[PDB]
Amino acid sequence: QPQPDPVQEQLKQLAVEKAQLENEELRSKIRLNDAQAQKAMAERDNKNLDY
Amino acid sequence: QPQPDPVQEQLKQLAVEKAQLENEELRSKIRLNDAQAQKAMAERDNKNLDY
């Protein structure tokens, strides 16, 4: 019978959750990019108004 | 019969979604670049006005 390694099964679980956070990583930065761009839209909208 | 690995099928699914976010990644940054450039257009338009 194979005797599973307590270290090995621990790391493999963490790598599974690691991939999930690496994916939530991008989603968070999508919300950051579009917020910055849409903010720059607002600060150029009033700049034309002063023109 | 092949016995699919619960870890393997989990990661392969995440890699599929990973590629999709890596693609939405670019689209978000396109919206950031053109917002910055068009904002710089506005802040040079009024600069000529002061001239």
Numbering used by the authors:
A (entry chain PB), B (entry chain PA): 612 to 662
Paper text:
N4-like phages have a genome size of about 75 kb, nearly twice that of T7, and encode around 70–90 ORFs, including a characteristic large virion-associated RNA polymerase (vRNAP) unique to this family of bacterial viruses. The massive 3,500-residue vRNAP 18,19, present in 4 ± 1 copies inside the mature virion 20, is ejected into the host upon infection. In stark contrast to the N4 transcriptional program, which has been studied extensively 17, many key questions about the role of phage N4 vRNAP as an ejection protein and its part in the DNA ejectosome remain unanswered. vRNAP (gp50) consists of three predicted domains: a likely membrane-spanning N-terminal domain (NTD), a single-subunit RNA polymerase (RNAP) domain, and a large C-terminal domain of unknown function (CTD). In this study, we use a complementary top-down and bottom-up approach by determining the cryo-EM structures of both the full-length recombinantly expressed vRNAP and the fully asymmetric N4 virion tail.
